[PDB]
């Protein structure tokens, strides 16, 4: 019943609550994805979960239903609500039209939801930002990146984590046509892109791939090592 | 922050709204002293008309809750009739809900309790009037009560209410340790010894209840005039 208008226009057209959510996604993990023309691929430099984590419940990588899956970046507990409501309405859109639900529609639902929390009476618009990847009825490995202002863009790298302005300018530099193959050059581009930022993948990185509406497979740190070694060898 | 703005706890306790509401009942000040008789709870108060243009019958404090309970209040008179109407409401609601006519004590508990929820929640001021209210039940003698604007009803013999409360209760304390159905040397003489007017029978309102006749009666200048000329001992 709390009805104070929080998200209000200040002077010079500046909607301060949303830009405060922009630092709130600037102060998270470092998520990254690549649309690799037959495959899509993610990655989020994780912390010290080997000391005493459980790797099963440190997941920045979730799954929406089977094909679309997202990597949030920021506040890591307001995100899980958006995960749950994405899964719920995604099952409702399996109820009505009965498709392998298109990635455009669910990312319009996420952006419309966060824009509906930039409007309602006193509820602090989210501090998350997504990487809605996936497929559709005919291949088309579309990636989407939302925003706490509820603006989604259909771009192809969108490194939107904490130290990821360097990663998106790197990915601006080093993604033209060399990653059109099956998986190896794409995943090599991702693990190269996050090994720009931190250290070795035996403690830090974890990834996920998705191939043609089957087999959302994560990569355990034994397998990530091979790719990391190849990158190191260069 | 907002200790003296909202009904919340300041440091060292002492929420700064109820004593700001206590100082509200001294505004102007038309002052009641209630006298209790082992068989008759008399009521006294002073009432001043400003300019002989008011209707003196309409201005009063002296309200009637039911056929057995009267009341008099000395707070700010805006907040008075909002409080006495709810007391009439809970009296008639008691008689409709629980059979017998309400006895005088838990009426004052109940209006003390809604005054509590005024001074518990925010966004409402604790309304500044205290309810000297008398009445007789079948079991005990005549009673008298006063809920404050904080909700602390006590069960009194003889307090007072309004401006000059301390001089009145000092006079009554000095004049009750000696031992009074007539109440001729107690009821008016608290006023005439506190503020020294030695009233003509206009400005004083008196409301009695007796064990022989429990109906609440507001007296007129004839019988209060005999009551005043009985101060010739």
């Amino acid at each position: 019943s709390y009805d104070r208008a929080i998200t209000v226009f200040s002077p010079d057209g500046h909607l301060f609550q949303v830009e405060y959510a922009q630092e709130a996604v600037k102060k998270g993990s470092t998520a990254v994805g690549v649309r690799g023309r037959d495959i899509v691929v993610l990655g989020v430099e994780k912390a010290s979960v080997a000391k005493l984590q459980d790797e099963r419940t440190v997941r920045k990588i979730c799954a929406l239903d089977d094909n679309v899956c997202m990597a949030f970046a920021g506040l890591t507990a307001d995100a899980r609500i958006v995960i749950n409501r994405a899964r719920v309405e995604c099952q409702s859109h399996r109820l009505t039209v009965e498709d392998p639900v298109t990635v455009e529609y669910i990312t319009r639902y996420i952006a419309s939801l966060k824009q509906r929390y930039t409007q309602s009476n006193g509820r602090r618009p989210f501090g998350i930002s997504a990487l809605i990847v996936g497929f559709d009825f005919d291949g088309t490995p579309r990636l989407y990146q939302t925003d706490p202002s509820g603006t989604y863009h259909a771009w192809k790298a969108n490194a939107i984590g904490r130290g990821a302005k360097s990663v998106r300018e790197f990915l601006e530099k080093n993604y033209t046509d060399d990653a059109i193959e099956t998986d190896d050059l794409t995943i090599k581009l991702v693990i190269k892109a996050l090994l720009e930022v931190v250290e070795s993948g035996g403690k830090n990185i974890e990834l996920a791939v998705m191939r043609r509406d089957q087999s959302l497979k994560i990569l355990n740190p034994e397998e990530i090592e091979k790719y990391v070694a190849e990158i190191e060898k260069e | 922050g907002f200790d003296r703005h909202i009904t919340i706890f300041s440091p060292e306790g002492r929420l700064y709204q109820v004593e700001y509401a206590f100082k509200a009942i001294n505004q102007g000040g038309l002052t009641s002293v209630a006298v209790r008789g082992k068989d008759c709870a008399v009521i006294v108060t002073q009432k001043k008309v400003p300019d002989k243009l008011l209707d003196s019958s309409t201005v009063t404090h002296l309200f009637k809750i039911t056929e057995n309970i009267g009341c008099v209040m000395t707070g700010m008179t805006a907040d008075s009739r909002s409080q006495v109407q709810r007391a009439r409401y809970e009296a008639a609601n008691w008689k409709y809900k629980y059979g017998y006519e309400i006895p005088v004590d838990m009426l004052c508990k109940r209006i003390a309790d809604i005054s509590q929820v005024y001074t518990q929640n925010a966004e409402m001021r604790p309304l500044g009037c205290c309810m000297i209210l008398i009445g007789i039940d079948e079991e005990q003698g005549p009673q008298v009560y006063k809920c404050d604007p904080a909700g602390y009803y006590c069960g009194f013999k003889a307090t007072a209410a309004g401006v000059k409360q301390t001089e009145s209760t000092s006079f009554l304390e000095k004049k009750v340790k000696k031992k009074f159905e007539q109440t001729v040397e107690t009821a008016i003489t608290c006023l005439s010894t506190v503020l020294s007017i030695d009233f003509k029978p206009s400005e004083i309102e008196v409301g009695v209840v007796t064990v022989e006749n429990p109906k609440f009666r507001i007296l007129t200048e004839a019988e209060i005039d005999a009551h005043l000329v009985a101060l010739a001992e």
Binding site: D3, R4, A5, I6, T7, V8, F9, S10, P11, D12, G13, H14, L15, A111, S112, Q115, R116, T118, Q119, S120, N121, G122, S149, G150, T151, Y152, H153, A154, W155, K156, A157, R168, L171, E172, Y175 | -
Partner: protein, 233 residues
């Protein structure tokens, strides 16, 4: 601070004159009503070149014969574009005909200055919609475009510029339009976008243009049509 429903010591609301800002922020869109159509264009300001530019929706078709062109705080319009199309098919549903442009523009602009803190159920709005847009549409009266404000003020327009280029492009558009389409208003409007140029020489990747002509319904231009026009300049 102060709230949203307060008037400013200049004379207008706070949130409305603050909602006139964040229209200077955001991309620029222009529209020209002609005698045989209405053309809309927007330079949707792609940030990086690593990416896909043909999914920044700034020309949105309300119906087959109403297309809008928003700017400013993007994606805040989607609720009132949703209300525009739901109201459109409600009109066609209940009345079995087309619409005007002042009925969709009448219906959307009622939602602009409709907000507040303490009101009905919390599905209401807090801030005003900080998105200025204009409905290019063809009617049985004529082709026309209705420039809205965030204040709910909507006006008849035949040559209107929004966004950051609301002064220089509007003053340039003030002197170059009087007559009719004859295919060259769409080529003398991207010329105004050619003077506006921020990052790139206005190729068929960073501007979206769409016309609404009375013969057809609308035409969101694809790439080879755009670069067919850009080759002619």
């Amino acid at each position: 601070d102060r709230g949203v429903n307060t008037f400013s010591p200049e004379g207008r609301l706070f949130q409305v004159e603050y909602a006139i800002e964040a229209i200077k922020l955001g991309s620029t869109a222009i529209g020209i009503q002609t005698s045989e159509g209405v053309c809309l264009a927007v330079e949707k300001r792609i940030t990086s070149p690593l990416m896909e530019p043909s999914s920044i929706e700034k020309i949105v078709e309300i119906d087959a014969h109403i297309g809008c062109a928003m700017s400013g705080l993007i994606a805040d319009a989607k609720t009132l574009i949703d209300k525009a199309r739901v109201e459109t098919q409600n009109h066609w549903f209940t009345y079995n005909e087309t619409m005007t442009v002042e009925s969709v523009t009448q219906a959307v602009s009622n939602l602009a200055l409709q907000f507040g803190e303490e009101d009905a159920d919390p599905g209401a709005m807090s801030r005003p919609f900080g998105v200025a847009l204009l409905f290019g549409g063809v009617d049985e009266k004529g082709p026309q475009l209705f420039h809205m404000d965030p204040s709910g003020t909507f006006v008849q327009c035949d040559a209107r510029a929004i966004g950051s280029a609301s002064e220089g492009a509007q003053s340039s558009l003030q002197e170059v339009y009087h007559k009719s389409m004859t295919l060259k208003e769409a080529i003398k409007s991207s010329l105004i976008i050619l003077k506006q140029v921020m990052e790139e020489k206005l190729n068929a990747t960073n501007i979206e243009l769409a016309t609404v002509q009375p013969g057809q319904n609308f035409h969101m231009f694809t790439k080879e049509e755009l670069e067919e026009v850009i080759k002619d300049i």
